[PDB]
Paper text:
Our crystal structures of apo MsBP (no zinc or substrate-bound) and Zn-MsBP (with zinc-bound) show that the presence of zinc induces structural differences, leading to a partially-closed substrate-binding cavity. The structure of MsBP displayed two chains in the a.s.u. No electron density attributable to a ligand was distinguished in either structure, indicating both proteins were crystallised in ligand-free forms. The intervening binding cleft shows a markedly positive charge, suggestive for orienting a negatively charged substrate. Overall, the structures of MsBP and Zn-MsBP overlay with r.m.s.d. 0.87 Å (Cα atoms), with the most striking difference caused by marked and localised tilting of helix 2, attributable to a lower degree of conformational variability in loop 3. As previously discussed, the general nature of the binding cleft of MsBP is positively charged, which is markedly different from structural relatives that display negatively charged binding cavity, appropriate for interaction with simple sugars.
Residue numbers in the entry: 10 to 18, 20 to 48, 51 to 108, 112 to 410
């Protein structure tokens, strides 16, 4: 039997129950036992210590790089059928220094869910689309409505949107040698950007202590004018808070002057300890073929990495006839995500130790937002702490 490990998937039990069921009908010799987890490295280490490593593991570019730098992922090129990469988007297939360590699965382009009713209360007609327009926008929301314009968490190991904003703001995080590269005019400007927003009462005070689940809660309460989220969460807004969804419009995500948006890549990898690597590759290919990826794109309102499924999903969206405004809203969001994908890139560099770097930056930025140190003081402390870590790991 094979053990499949997926990341943060309750709402998608029926999808998994059918596709894995189909797999079990096709491959009775390698039945799948599925476990979904949130905190992934601790559980992989325990299974590998017991010499019971899973066969297919769901990863993202940052975590996949930490594992592959240590020789833990199978080079799939040896086992992949010839012309298997032809079935995937080339930009996302090549998004995996240790060879081909992962097969692309699905991906998400997050949009700006804008509360249009809060905008009219603030005397605004639309939400900003670039970060240098965020302060003026946030002030108008804060003073005329009392609500908050946006919510970006600085809890060290929560969402990476803050670190992604650094990249969108032109900040260079690491050089070749893995040394700190953000003590630059861009990095100091980015640190001051977030410090000044918090100190001026423009951000919710709990951004230093709560993650995107609080942002979700604030938007559904009508207390957040812009929520960085995808199409799938829009349907739960429709059910949980119809008053807010009725005045919600999907909008392009916030970017920097370069325009690039972020895309969250989900992949499937085969640990080197796996004793059924060939069957594991077959399972990863089955989960990511045209039919299964298209079906998951519909049920999850997500974008696939399969060319066949991506074109099929784009085609269904262009000719979909929604029966009510709710379905039309969901169609508008999914279509905007599919259109944004042509300009979106992966922004957190798929390098080892990026979560250590995120934690150091978020911690120092947090000290500056609370007024315990200056912004430049946070930059220096972050730079020196990262170089402490980087000299020990990569001398």
């Amino acid at each position: 039997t094979l053990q499949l490990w997926t990341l943060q998937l309750p709402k998608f039990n029926p999808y998994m129950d059918d596709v894995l069921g189909s797999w079990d009908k096709l491959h009775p010799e390698a039945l799948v036992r599925w476990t979904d987890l949130p905190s992934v490295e601790r559980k992989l280490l325990a299974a590998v210590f017991a010499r019971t490593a899973p066969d297919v593991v769901n990863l993202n570019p940052p975590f996949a790089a930490n594992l592959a730098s240590k020789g833990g992922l199978t080079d799939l090129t040896a086992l992949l059928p010839p012309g298997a990469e032809q079935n995937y988007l080339p930009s996302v297939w090549e998004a995996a220094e240790a060879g081909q360590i992962a097969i692309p699965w699905y991906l998400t382009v997050r949009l700006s869910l804008v509360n249009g009713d809060l905008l009219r209360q603030a005397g605004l007609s639309r939400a900003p689309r670039r970060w240098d327009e965020v302060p003026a926008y946030a002030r108008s929301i804060r003073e005329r409505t009392g609500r908050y314009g946006l919510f970006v968490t600085v809890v060290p190991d929560d969402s990476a949107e803050l670190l992604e904003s650094f990249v969108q703001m032109g900040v260079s995080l690491l050089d070749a040698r893995q040394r700190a590269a953000f003590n630059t005019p861009a990095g100091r400007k980015a640190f001051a950007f977030w410090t000044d927003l918090y100190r001026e009462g423009l951000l919710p005070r709990e951004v230093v202590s709560q993650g995107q689940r609080r942002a979700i809660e604030l938007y559904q309460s009508g207390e957040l004018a812009l929520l960085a989220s995808g199409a799938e969460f829009l349907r739960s807004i429709q059910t949980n808070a119809p008053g807010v969804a009725a005045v919600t419009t999907p909008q392009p995500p916030l970017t920097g002057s370069d325009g690039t948006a972020n895309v969250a890549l989900m992949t499937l990898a085969v640990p080197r300890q796996s004793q059924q690597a060939g069957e594991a590759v077959e399972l990863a290919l089955f989960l990511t073929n045209g039919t299964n990826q298209a079906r998951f794109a519909r049920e999850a309102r997500v974008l696939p990495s399969s060319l066949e499924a991506l074109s099929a999903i784009r085609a269904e969206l262009e000719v979909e006839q929604p029966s009510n405004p709710a379905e039309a809203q969901i169609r508008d969001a999914r279509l905007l995500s599919a259109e944004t994908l042509n300009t979106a890139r992966v922004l957190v560099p798929a390098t080892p130790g990026v979560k250590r770097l995120q934690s150091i930056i978020y911690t120092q930025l947090q000290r500056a937002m609370l007024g315990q140190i200056s912004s430049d003081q946070a930059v220096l402390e972050a730079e020196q702490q990262w170089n402490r870590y980087a000299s020990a790991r990569w001398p």
